[PDB]
Design a protein around this ligand. Structure first.
Ligand SMILES: *[C@@H]1O[C@H](CO)[C@@H](O[C@@H]2O[C@H](CO)[C@@H](O[C@@H]3O[C@H](CO)[C@@H](O)[C@H](O[C@H]4O[C@H](CO)[C@@H](O)[C@H](O)[C@@H]4O)[C@@H]3O)[C@H](O)[C@H]2NC(C)=O)[C@H](O)[C@H]1NC(C)=O
Ligand SMILES: *[C@@H]1O[C@H](CO)[C@@H](O[C@@H]2O[C@H](CO)[C@@H](O[C@@H]3O[C@H](CO)[C@@H](O)[C@H](O[C@H]4O[C@H](CO)[C@@H](O)[C@H](O)[C@@H]4O)[C@@H]3O)[C@H](O)[C@H]2NC(C)=O)[C@H](O)[C@H]1NC(C)=O
Ligand SMILES: *[C@@H]1O[C@H](CO)[C@@H](O[C@@H]2O[C@H](CO)[C@@H](O)[C@H](O)[C@H]2NC(C)=O)[C@H](O)[C@H]1NC(C)=O
Ligand code: NAG
Ligand code: NAG
Ligand code: VMF
Ligand code: VMF
Lengths: 390, 392
């Protein structure tokens, strides 16, 4: 989408994975989907260094709406859970130097059963712009035809443009097309700043593996369309929650950097460990994810329960990730000729290699003839940056 | 097995899950199966508080043997990896106040392909006894006949008895029966101090879920057989390795306590986080696992991606574990009538409830009519101890 936005992958916080559709504000006031929850996350994004690291978009997912539209046919936030309304929340978020994302659905209802946007695309876009919304996640539930799906996503894209406000447009179009016909990613990229490809993430290593394996399987089709203005979205970061070991969290951070994925945390910023916070705020890894060149990495090799991924970066540098997919035993040794990396150019005549994950360590100079040897933890990843000696 | 051993579940360290059959001592010296690895592990078991916590048996798994037996037809240790031999390793282990377990197979070869014990049961039992072996793990590979499996396990049991040395006998008999017929656990308990029931564990939450779900599903068959001298073995503890989140590690520790499982760590004691060490050395949870009553717990309840397990303890106390199996979202609320726990006995007329996992905190007095309210993390477990009391 050529709207001047998402020139690097969007970074921020989205409530869905950790908070879901919790409407019980009476019994769970601190975890229900409410204006107070978002104010708390905004305050912590400022005070705990998240904004400084690049996490800029504070996004509402499903279950913010009132059960029905108002007398004017416009969407409204829930009167009890969002008493001051979305425009007022957007004012607060902006006063912290942050941006607000909101959620809507192309069909007749949202996935949770709240008002859909079919029939109201222009009214809904103008409402969002009037509210000061900075990003829209547009879901695909309750949509009876592929044609309505396509028409709705394109129509909403254009209506957002017509409002005159800069609004990141996050689509789920491919995900809902895929079971029925193969998406045309050139078209989707014309209309979307990033697009969900695969099933929802959850708090599990199984989910991470299946997202990586799907991206791996379809990379011929999706890698080259990604670039400034339009990204593949493998769904939220779940670092900081409950289901991933430290090494599985490292694998997610490293591979979301390799994949030039949007970095949407879905966690509880009020209760997050120092390790998880340091990983999500890792400056070198975010710099890889945010590389201005914007070329999505890809899987180079797969075999012996090992995976090698690499990503070309700005100025003749490369990122390389090595995954140990064996879920038994100990740190397993992997060696690869450095001449096989970076299309044979990364380390010709030589390169300086810095390991970034799981710990930062300079490895030294590698000649074009060298072999790189590493020990990779089960379900973990070693992330390296290669700088050509020039 | 009525040999006076394993009156509580055996506690120790077993190399298989973390170290497997790594024979490459040139390229992988720190992880190959060698006498130095076990000597170092023994020293760390002493110095790092593992022995004090109850972990007593330092156990070798597969891939310690030489490719064939010696001229006297006796098993021999690998010359390169175990140059000083099993007796000196046992002397070292004993000199640290620990006990040494070793491995063998009922069939013609071990699962890794080293000499089997069929034909040498008495010779091998005497070899182990002469070496100072204190525990035997007896695998079931390369024995495709049920009669040979059964007779071999019974035979090795009697041969160990004949040596006159106290040797914990750890069997895999039930696991290897399953392809053909359902085990007779009364007979297995007759011959074994503990017995592997289900497929090998690995470093994953999937593996733990599958062990728990199989145990739950089959609990009618196996729970009542367990008791002093003979235990169900759901396989090794993998806390301290790479595949489990903190909450999944808590779930394994808690539920191995509920199940009266042998506690065999399989990790690298040289590289283990303070958290994992504190969990594996948790004195209250180990005390539950080692409860002298020795009655295995069971799944009480299941539903809405929740599980409730409980275990009866000595002196009218109970352990209660609540598992959240929903792998999305945040901590989920669970409430239960305190009268539904512990067969209605735990909190009659009252009980004092102490949370032990994920953190230790006293919850207070709950009368028989009370409700217990808890919040459980995704894939995590809340472990509670209920002490029967007449006090308020
Ligand atoms: C509605 O849709 C229209 C058409 O798709 C869209 O207009 C496009 O806007 C983008 C960005 O605002 C334009 O891209 C810019 O083109 C100008 C040409 O003068 C360049 O100078 C810009 O360069 C930027 O980036 C440079 C490095 O690449 C930097 O030097 C600097 O940061 C510049 O800002 C940039 O390439 C694009 O040309 C137009 N296209 C058309 C047909 O007008 C509009 O933004 C959409 N409106 C909304 C509200 O979404
Ligand atoms: C070879 O096999 C035989 C049996 O096949 C085995 O001897 C048996 O097991 C134990 C040996 O320790 C004996 O059990 C003891 O019996 C006396 C009877 O008065 C009891 O006082 C003992 O009780 C104490 O220890 C128990 C722990 O086991 C506690 O439950 C109790 O509270 C006491 O502390 C104990 O029950 C059993 O009688 C024999 N049975 C026979 C001989 O028929 C022998 O040990 C095996 N040898 C080797 C080397 O394994
Ligand atoms: C996928 O969609 C794109 C855009 O909708 C198609 O590309 C356009 O094709 C028309 C001719 O049909 C050209 O006039 C345009 O210049 C093309 N646009 C771009 C950006 O290349 C493309 O043909 C579609 N692919 C398939 C296989 O249907
Ligand atoms: C919404 O419902 C109406 C009537 O039931 C139907 O005509 C329309 O196609 C639906 N829209 C979508 C996107 O499914
Ligand atoms: C199981 O084995 C024991 C010991 O031989 C025997 O007493 C019992 O009858 C057996 N059970 C069945 C069902 O055969
Ligand atoms: O109802 C909201 C949910 N619907 C999407 C389906 O992919 C999820 O990401 C989340 O937004
Ligand atoms: O070869 C060694 C393996 N044999 C058993 C099969 O279940 C495993 O526990 C491990 O001991």
């Amino acid at each position: 989408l050529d709207n001047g936005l998402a020139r690097t992958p969007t970074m921020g916080w989205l409530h869905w994975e950790r908070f879901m559709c919790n409407l019980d504000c009476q019994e769970e006031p601190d975890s229900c989907i409410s204006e107070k929850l978002f104010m708390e996350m905004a305050e912590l994004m400022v005070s705990e260094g998240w904004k400084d690291a690049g996490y800029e978009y504070l996004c509402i997912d499903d279950c913010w709406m009132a059960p029905q539209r108002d007398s004017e046919g416009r969407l409204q936030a829930d009167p009890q859970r969002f008493p001051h309304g979305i425009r007022q929340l957007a004012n607060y978020v902006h006063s912290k130097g942050l941006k607000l994302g909101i959620y809507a659905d192309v069909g007749n209802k949202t996935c949770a059963g709240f008002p859909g946007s079919f029939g109201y695309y222009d009214i809904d876009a103008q409402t969002f712009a009037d509210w000061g919304v900075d990003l829209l996640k547009f879901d695909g539930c309750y949509c009876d035809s592929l044609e309505n799906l396509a028409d709705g996503y394109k129509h909403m894209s254009l209506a957002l443009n017509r409002t005159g406000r800069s609004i990141v447009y996050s689509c789920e179009w491919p995900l809902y097309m895929w079971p029925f016909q193969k998406p045309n990613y050139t078209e989707i990229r014309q209309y979307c700043n990033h697009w969900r490809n695969f099933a929802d993430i959850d708090d599990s290593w199984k989910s991470i593996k299946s997202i990586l394996d799907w991206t791996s399987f379809n990379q011929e089709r999706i890698v080259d369309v990604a670039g400034p203005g339009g990204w593949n979205d493998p769904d939220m970061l779940v670092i900081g929650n409950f289901g991933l070991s430290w090494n599985q969290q490292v694998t997610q951070m490293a591979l979301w950097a390799i994949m030039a994925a949007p970095l949407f945390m879905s966690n509880d910023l009020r209760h997050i460990s120092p390790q998880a916070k340091a990983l999500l705020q890792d400056k070198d890894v975010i710099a890889i994810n945010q590389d201005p060149l914007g070329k999505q990495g890809y899987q180079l090799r797969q075999g012996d329960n090992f995976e090698v991924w690499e990503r070309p970066l700005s100025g003749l540098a490369w990122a390389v990730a090595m995954i140990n997919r064996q879920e038994i035993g100990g740190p397993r040794s992997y060696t690869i000729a450095v001449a096989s990396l970076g299309k044979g150019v990364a380390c010709n005549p030589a390169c300086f290699i810095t390991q970034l994950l799981p710990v930062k360590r300079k490895l030294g100079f590698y000649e074009w003839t060298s072999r790189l040897r590493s020990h990779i933890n089960p379900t973990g990843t070693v992330l390296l940056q290669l700088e050509n000696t020039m």
